[PDB]
C-alpha cells in the first residue's frame, strides 16, 4: 500500500470530474489537483501475487522522471484492490485526430520538428531504462507547438480487465513490431510480449508514416490478415514501395521498420537522421 502523501507534489485534495474514455486499462477521468489532472482508475484482482510488489516498483520508477516532452507523472495511490494513477492533464488535440483534420497544414518542417520532440521524449525514457510500451499517435498530444507523450509504461501492470479468443484492435496492430505479433497467442497476457527499446522505435516509424500519409499504413483488414502481413514483414515492404515520399523520409521509415530488431536505430541516432533533412 502506497498513498498520495509520499509524493514530490504537495497533496491536499483531488476531485474527480467527467470521464473522458474507457479502455482495457481502467477509466480515465478529467480531474482537478489548482490545475487539471488526468486520473486513471484501476482494479487489481492480483491479490498480492507480486502484482502490487511490481506495481510499487514501477510506480516508484516513474517518480524519478521529469521532461518537457513527457507527461508529468504526479501520484499513484493504491488502496487495494482499487488503484489510481494521476498524471498531468494535456490540453489540446491528440496527434491522431490532429494529423487527420483537413484544416491542418503540415509541411516538411512542421513534420521534422514534431518528430524531434517525440524522439527527445522517447530518448529520455530510454536513458532512464523506462521502456515505453504502447507508443502510438493516440497517446501523443499537440497544443500549438507543445508536444507531450502519454500513458508510458502502462502495459507493465497486471490488473484485471474477455475470453479465450484474442482481443485486438486495428489501430494498435499498425504499431506492433513483428517480434511481438509472432508471439501473440490466446490465453497469453500483454505482459508476456517482447516489448523492448526496439519495439518502441518501430512504433515511432508508424508514427512517422502517419505524419506523412495522414493515415495508417494498412487499410482496415481483418485482424488475421494484418497479423501475417506484419509478422512476415511483407506488409511493410509493400506499403513502402506502393507510395514514395522521399529518399530521406523513406530512409528513416525503412530504418525504423527493419525486420531484424537489432537493425533498428537508437533514438539518439534518430535525432541526427532528422537533422540531415529538407
Amino acid at each position: 500500500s502506497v498513498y498520495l502523501q509520499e509524493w514530490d507534489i504537495p497533496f491536499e485534495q483531488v476531485e474527480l470530474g467527467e470521464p473522458i474514455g474507457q479502455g482495457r486499462w481502467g477509466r480515465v477521468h478529467r480531474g482537478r489537483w489548482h490545475g487539471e489532472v488526468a486520473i486513471r482508475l484501476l482494479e487489481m484482482d492480483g491479490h498480492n501475487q507480486d502484482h502490487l510488489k511490481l506495481f510499487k516498483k514501477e510506480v516508484m520508477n516513474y517518480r524519478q522522471t521529469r521532461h518537457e516532452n513527457v507527461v508529468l507523472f504526479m501520484g499513484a495511490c493504491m488502496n487495494p484492490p482499487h488503484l489510481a494513477i494521476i498524471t498531468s492533464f494535456c490540453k489540446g488535440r491528440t496527434l491522431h485526430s490532429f494529423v487527420r483534420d483537413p484544416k491542418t497544414s503540415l509541411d516538411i518542417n512542421k513534420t521534422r520538428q514534431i518528430a524531434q520532440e517525440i524522439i527527445k521524449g522517447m530518448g529520455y525514457l530510454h536513458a532512464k531504462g523506462i521502456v515505453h510500451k504502447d507508443l502510438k499517435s493516440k497517446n501523443v498530444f499537440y497544443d500549438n507547438g507543445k508536444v507531450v507523450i502519454t500513458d508510458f509504461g502502462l502495459f507493465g501492470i497486471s490488473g484485471v480487465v474477455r475470453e479465450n479468443q484474442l482481443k485486438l484492435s486495428h489501430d494498435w496492430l499498425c504499431y506492433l513490431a513483428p517480434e511481438i505479433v509472432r508471439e501473440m497467442t490466446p490465453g497469453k497476457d500483454e505482459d508476456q510480449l517482447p516489448f523492448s527499446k526496439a519495439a518502441d522505435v518501430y512504433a515511432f516509424g508508424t508514427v512517422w508514416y502517419e505524419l506523412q500519409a495522414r493515415d495508417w499504413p494498412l487499410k482496415n483488414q481483418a485482424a488475421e490478415a494484418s497479423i501475417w502481413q506484419i509478422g512476415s514483414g511483407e506488409g511493410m515492404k509493400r506499403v513502402l514501395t506502393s507510395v514514395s515520399l522521399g529518399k530521406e523520409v523513406s530512409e528513416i521509415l525503412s530504418a525504423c521498420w527493419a525486420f531484424d530488431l537489432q537493425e533498428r536505430p537508437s533514438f539518439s541516432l534518430l535525432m541526427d537522421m532528422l537533422e540531415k533533412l529538407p
Binding site: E163, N164, Q165, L166, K167, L168, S169, H170, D171, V181, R182, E183, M184, T185, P186, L218, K219, N220, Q221, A222, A223, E224, A225, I227, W228, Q229, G231, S232, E234, G235, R238
Partner: protein, 308 residues
C-alpha cells in the same frame, strides 16, 4: 435459383409469418437459453407474437448518426430470402447494442453437431455443398455480395432438413466502423485474403473447402495430423497463418473417401484463386451431381445423432 415449387411454399410460409409483427423493442423478448459466445446469440421468446426467434447480441458504444446509416444499409437484408439463407426479422438499436433477431435453427451449428457426432459422413457433406454453392450463387447474382466469413459455426441446421447460411457481409459501412475485430485459434481465411491483395468470392470457396475437410475428418486440419494420428482418427496464431500461406494446402486421406469427394475439396483448396474452381465449375462437378441425385433422409440422421 432453380426454385422448386415446395421452396416457394416454405419461403411464402415464412413471408406470411413476416408481417405477424411490425415493431421491435427490448422488452418484447424473453431470454429462453444461451446458444453460444463469439457477439453472443440467445434463444428468445417474442411476446407480441408467438414466434420463437434467435436474438444475437453485439455490444457496441458508438454515436447515433453513424448508426442510422448502418441500419439503413442493414434493412436490405430483409430483401434477401432463400431456402439456403436464414430468415431475418428486423434490426433495431437498444441499450448500447444492436440486436439482430433471426430464424431459430434447432440443430445449431455444424461445429456443435460435429462435436456430438465425432465425424460427419461423406453423404451428408454432399448435400451441404450444394446448399452452400447455391447460396453463394444467389448472393452473387441477385445482390452482388460476397459472404466473407464462411465457416462451420455459421452453418445452421433444423429438423425439417433445411441448410442455411448466416453472418454474411451486407454492410460496407459496418465493416469499416468496427474498429475492434476478434481473432481466435482457428482461421478459415484464404491465403490471398491474408496477404491483402484483391479478392472476390474465390476466397469464400477456399473457406468452404477448408471447412469441409474439418467436418469430414473431425479435426481442424492445420497443422496436419501425423501418419499415426490419422489412423487413430500449442501454436501461436502467426504460425498457423504462415502455414496457410506457405505450406501445401490440407487434403483428404486417400483410403476412406471417394475420388469425387477428394477431387472436389482439392479444387476448392487450390491456393491460386484464379485456378481454384469457381461456382460455375463447382455446380457441374461429379461430386455435386452424385449428391444431388442421392436419396438421403437428412432429417432422420440429424435427429438420431443429436438425440432429437
Amino acid at each position: 435459383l432453380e426454385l422448386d415449387e415446395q421452396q416457394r411454399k416454405r419461403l411464402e410460409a415464412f413471408l406470411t409469418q413476416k408481417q405477424k409483427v411490425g415493431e421491435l423493442k427490448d422488452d418484447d423478448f424473453e431470454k429462453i437459453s444461451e446458444l453460444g459466445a463469439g457477439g453472443v446469440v440467445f434463444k428468445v421468446s417474442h411476446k407480441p407474437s408467438g414466434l420463437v426467434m434467435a436474438r444475437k447480441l453485439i455490444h457496441l458504444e458508438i454515436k447515433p448518426a453513424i448508426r442510422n446509416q448502418i441500419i439503413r444499409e442493414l434493412q436490405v437484408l430483409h430483401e434477401c430470402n432463400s431456402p439456403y439463407i436464414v430468415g431475418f426479422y428486423g434490426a433495431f438499436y437498444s441499450d448500447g447494442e444492436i440486436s439482430i433477431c433471426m430464424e431459430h435453427m434447432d440443430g445449431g451449428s455444424l461445429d456443435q453437431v460435429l462435436k456430438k457426432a465425432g465425424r460427419i459422413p461423406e453423404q451428408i457433406l454432399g448435400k451441404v455443398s450444394i446448399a452452400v454453392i447455391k447460396g453463394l450463387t444467389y448472393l452473387r447474382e441477385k445482390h452482388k455480395i460476397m459472404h466473407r466469413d464462411v465457416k462451420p459455426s455459421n452453418i445452421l441446421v433444423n429438423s425439417r432438413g433445411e441448410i442455411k447460411l448466416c453472418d454474411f457481409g451486407v454492410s460496407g459501412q459496418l465493416i469499416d466502423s468496427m474498429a475492434n475485430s476478434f481473432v481466435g485459434t482457428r482461421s478459415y481465411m484464404s491465403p490471398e485474403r491474408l496477404q491483402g491483395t484483391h479478392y472476390s468470392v474465390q476466397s469464400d470457396i477456399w473457406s468452404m473447402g477448408l471447412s469441409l475437410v474439418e467436418m469430414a475428418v473431425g479435426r481442424y486440419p492445420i497443422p496436419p495430423p501425423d501418419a499415426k494420428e490419422l489412423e487413430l482418427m500449442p501454436m501461436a496464431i502467426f504460425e498457423l497463418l504462415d502455414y496457410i500461406v506457405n505450406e501445401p494446402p490440407p487434403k483428404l486421406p486417400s483410403a476412406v473417401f471417394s475420388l469425387e469427394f477428394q477431387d472436389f475439396v482439392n479444387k476448392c483448396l487450390i491456393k491460386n484463386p484464379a485456378e481454384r474452381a469457381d461456382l460455375k465449375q463447382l455446380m457441374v462437378h461429379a461430386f455435386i451431381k452424385r449428391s444431388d441425385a442421392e436419396e438421403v433422409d437428412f432429417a432422420g440422421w440429424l435427429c438420431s445423432t443429436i438425440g432429437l
